[PDB]
Design a protein around this nucleic acid. Structure first.
Length: 114
DNA sequence: GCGCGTACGTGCGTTTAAGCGGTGCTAGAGCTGTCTACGACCAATTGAGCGGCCTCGGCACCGGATTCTCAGGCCTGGCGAT
């Protein structure tokens, strides 16, 4: 699970956060020819290499384009970083992160790659 | 090949002058009669029209010069989607 190369402030200084089978790195997509949508949204919970400190990276646009981004700082509070990661995934897909081993999908919202 | 905008083809209802048969009249095409205006007939005169003759400048056109306009390019704002 690599850190986004567009995360130029934190790539090569941090890793993706993981626990047991779970991995806090996910790419969302939404494509719809009726209204000409073809877009993406990357989400990553990142932890620094040298110290127990956290951020949520996010990067989005039209598919294959640079678009926009944000690096949300969480200090030593992993629970805040988990909450922000899970909230963005929930708001973009109308369904939970945790009890979704089977990926159900709804209209007007993002899909997710494997 | 086709998205989608619309106008006339097709069915029902209203009502008006087309189509019609009788009544009635004089407007005017056609018949019969008047009579003199004028083309073609018939001839001599004579110059305009047409056949041969020039002769000159309108036109085509080759040399040289300038403007018109199509083809081959260039850059900044509108607003599209994120």
């Amino acid at each position: 699970a690599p850190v986004d190369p567009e995360c130029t402030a934190k790539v090569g200084k941090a890793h993706v956060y993981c626990e047991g089978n779970d991995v806090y790195d996910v790419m969302l997509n939404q494509t719809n020819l009726r209204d000409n949508n073809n877009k993406y949204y990357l989400i990553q919970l990142l932890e620094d290499d040298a110290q127990r400190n956290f951020s949520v990276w996010m990067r989005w646009g039209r598919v294959g384009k640079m678009g926009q981004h944000s690096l949300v700082a969480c200090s030593g509070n992993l629970n805040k970083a988990k909450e922000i990661f899970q909230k963005k995934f929930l708001d973009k897909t109308k369904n939970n992160w945790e009890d979704r081993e089977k990926f159900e999908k709804v209209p007007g919202k993002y899909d997710m790659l494997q």
